[model samples]
Target: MKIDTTVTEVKENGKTYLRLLKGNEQLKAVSDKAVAGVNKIGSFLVRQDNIVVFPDNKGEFDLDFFNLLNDNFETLVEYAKMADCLDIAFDINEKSYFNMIMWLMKNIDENWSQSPYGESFYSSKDIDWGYKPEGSLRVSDHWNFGQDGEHCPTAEPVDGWAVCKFENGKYHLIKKF
Candidate 1:
């Protein structure tokens, strides 16, 4: 591909951010942290004469956090403090309340601005900040939440079998697909 370096600056809340563009995409940095992230990638990979190796690789970008906002505000933020890349569901057509959640995030963390840093990033509105994908052994493509009156992934449908409910909480055992 093609690559070149261009550095520009912008001020936010009196803090300076360096917007370093290489090609059409940008290697954006905040304080020294984002710069360090970019520098690290440049060292491990390549950066010679306005050209770079692994230009498409995500290693060039660093993500400090992923914020997920939901009605479960206290629960989400409480956990966000201890983790990175929080996720929340997005309803494309729903005009749901989003600003309130983000407002709380800024109050919680002074560094909050824009969204999380991703090699491939998304606005807070489009992020699945708290999503935990089913690991290797788990089947996400097709799986029931639970037998009945239960939502835990582990609580019901114990491997290769589950109950088929008709009505009034009645069920029959059947082999799982």
Candidate 2:
């Protein structure tokens, strides 16, 4: 799939920074399709050499996070599409949390334990968060256990859940409870 993006450069404090314009909107538009078991859709901000900026106050920026985003741009887009599907499925009121464990299980590897929070599940050897290649440009979310570490649940489960299937690049609800 092809995705379009716009980047702009700005100077501040005698330093130059690059920003992704309307990143969330662009990702939402491209990720209208469904991937894995969820629609890969969610909020994200890219700035300062492909660095991801989170909307949550408790969020922090890290070099690894930046490299993950920079190296896995397309993969992240697919991830966002799946997240969007979950947002609609769960009817999340605010920014929804992207379940990294669930995502890895569905898309990458399915060997993770059932615990909601733990350090044992996030080994670099088991899961690849994308690495920064040499001579890569910096630039630059959503909350994920893998991304944000441990925190209060970012989304609340509603009364019933919805079952969806990928069709025509989008998720169609096959059944709802």
Candidate 3:
């Protein structure tokens, strides 16, 4: 569907916001369940990105999730391009909203690197740390260590072990230790 909404930038207090200047009437037709889910997950992403959404008097009539997307507009656009779902970015539908949410969830923490050892990296999103076989010091995938960390393998040794790296939605062993 072609959304006729006009998204624009507006400044309030000392922060900038991408506000929906028009088309809110159409946005109100979106399902309450979809809007609720988007707002719930979108709120987390906003916090993670250090963007704040203040309460508006518009209440339920306001497209909260759409505003959230506007707040992170650049990230959303880039992710949509990469995911090849640019068409859905502005479409008002459950799938489009969830797709945007998924993009935010995946890309919001893209800069976070693993910590030392095999400890899990905790975030708002649940990441699959892969698996560790029984009686083995190795884990199925290692996303909790740095390139130079003892648990992560590199070209040279650092008294460390080797583990799998997740890429392209699959895990592959980097080294054997």
Candidate 4:
């Protein structure tokens, strides 16, 4: 996604402003004051990077957290742009957090969609209420777990993996696999 910025002063509040744009589309408008605050607290500022942690159990809560991370990262990147700095840190370590970020970029995609779901589960992994299909990727895709893949190693249409699909304006499982 492309992001553009507008830096200016507000005549009314006397507070400076920073605007975020995507192709002439305004996504967010922040007071220069607020931007300054973010400049102080944002990972790009405070941590010099971003940090995403994974829980041992890869389940629904993890997915929700992943979604938020994606959203927050988007905003943080915008802040990075506005601040006129490029190198942002992810975690506090001798090694760059980019170490894991590089790994992350390769894994979460169409074929094995699990970026949003921290870790994967094995087939026999226990879930409190069974599996919830709504937050999954695509059919036959590696789902953060071997077991999450349904019939793993190679989930065939009838014997393995299944997750939700949206069609006809409704939600249903692609349970055929």
The candidate scoring highest on TM-score is 3
lDDT of 1 by residue, 4-80 (tens): 34446758899997644443253322211112212323221111112222222443322222112222345444434
Q: lDDT of all the models against the reference?
A: 0.30, 0.31, 0.37, 0.32
Give the per-residue lDDT digits (tens) of candidate 4, residues 59-176: 1112333333344564545434433446344322212233233333433342443323323222222222244343433333233344554322222233323343423322244433
Name the top lDDT candidate.
3
Tens digit of per-residue lDDT, candidate 2, span 1-177: 222234557588999866544543444432332121101222244322232333222222232333444454555455444334222121122212223323343533433221222222221233223332222211112122354443211232222223233233222333233
lDDT of 3 by residue, 1-177 (tens): 222334567689999876654433344454221222112122212222222222233333235555555545555545445444423323223333444344444534553333243322322232434433222222222433455342323333322233444443333454333
Count of residue pairs whose backbone atoms collide, per candidate: 8, 22, 0, 12
The regions of model 4 sitting more than 4 angstroms off are 1-13, 16-96, 115-177
Window of ten residues with lowest summed lDDT in model 4: 31-40
Model 1 has an lDDT value of 0.30
Could you give me the TM-score of model 1 versus the true structure?
Answer: 0.19
Off by over 4 Å in 1: 22-37, 40-177
The TM-scores, one per candidate, come to 0.19, 0.22, 0.24, 0.21
In candidate 1, how many Å is residue 168 off? 35
TM-score head-to-head 1 vs 3, winner: 3
lDDT of residue 176 for candidate 4:
32
